[PDB]
């Protein structure tokens, strides 16, 4: 079957969370978890919590085997952006963008 | 009575955006650049619909020349002879015959060689 878990409004730029999503795409649940505990990034800890939740849903709501699962899909969409200001040289003011992210993970066993 | 110009500009712009399908870059997205490309496309087709009648005629002549050079003769000499013989075959037909039934072409040359 197929199980998924999403994390909305995640305070983290989508370009930085898309660098750790290209390391667990098409890997096994076991390997993926091990790779997320060795990666030195600020998104690994957040992504690891989402992957864990996705596995629990496939072992409870679908009661599937968690010893033969494989990460099928894994992407991150953009979310509401906050607008901020900070002073410059003279009386000018530059703009700051605090973008968010919508992490999503779909775990499956590879069987219709 | 006020008249809103909605659902009339998008419908006209969408038609031009669908006419530029298969372009490279943002030429199949942005309407501004798309329009310019479409306009140029139409100007090329019109001018390329008259150059296609000259390109194909240049091809036939080439083929005939090669096929007419296998019987110790030149295109200019063959063409001249055929006209004096009274034949009215087209250049596209003359080439087609030579490519396929080569035996038939041989006879034609003989007739043109008899008219000197």
């Amino acid at each position: 079957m197929e199980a998924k878990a999403v994390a909305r409004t995640i305070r983290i730029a989508p370009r930085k969370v898309r660098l750790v999503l290209d390391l667990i795409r098409g890997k096994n649940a076991a390997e993926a978890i091990a790779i997320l505990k060795l990666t030195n990034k600020a998104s690994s800890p957040v992504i690891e919590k989402v992957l864990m939740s996705a596995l629990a849903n496939a072992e409870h709501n679908y009661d599937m085997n968690t010893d033969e699962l494989v990460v099928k899909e894994a992407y991150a969409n953009e979310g509401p952006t906050l607008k901020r200001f900070r002073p410059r040289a003279q009386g000018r003011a530059s703009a700051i963008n605090k973008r968010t992210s919508h992490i999503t993970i779909v775990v499956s066993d590879g069987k219709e | 009575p006020r008249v809103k110009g909605g659902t009339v500009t998008r419908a006209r712009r969408k038609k031009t955006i669908k006419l530029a399908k298969g372009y490279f870059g943002s030429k199949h997205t942005l309407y501004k650049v798309a329009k310019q490309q479409v306009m140029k496309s139409g100007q090329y087709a019109f001018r390329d619909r008259r150059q296609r009648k000259r390109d194909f005629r240049k091809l036939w002549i080439t083929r005939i020349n090669a096929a007419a050079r296998q019987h110790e003769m030149s295109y200019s000499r063959l063409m001249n002879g055929l006209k004096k013989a009274g034949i009215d075959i087209n250049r596209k037909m003359l080439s087609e015959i030579a490519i396929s039934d080569e035996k038939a072409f041989a006879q034609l040359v003989t007739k043109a060689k008899d008219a000197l």
């Binding site: 505990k37 060795l38 990666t39 | -």
Partner: protein, 47 residues
């Protein structure tokens, strides 16, 4: 000192070809079940 023309999506995606992370060592443990870094302090301490 300022861009003469804006960069396209093609050229921008071509410059980000070597911009990525690399998978680490991740040495297997003899008695713990979980993985660990090579030449580290744990239950594996490398292999």
């Amino acid at each position: 000192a300022v861009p003469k023309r804006r960069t396209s999506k093609t050229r921008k995606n071509k410059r980000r070809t070597h911009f990525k992370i690399s998978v680490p060592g991740m040495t297997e443990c003899p008695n713990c079940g979980e993985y660990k870094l090579s030449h580290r302090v744990c239950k594996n301490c490398g292999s």
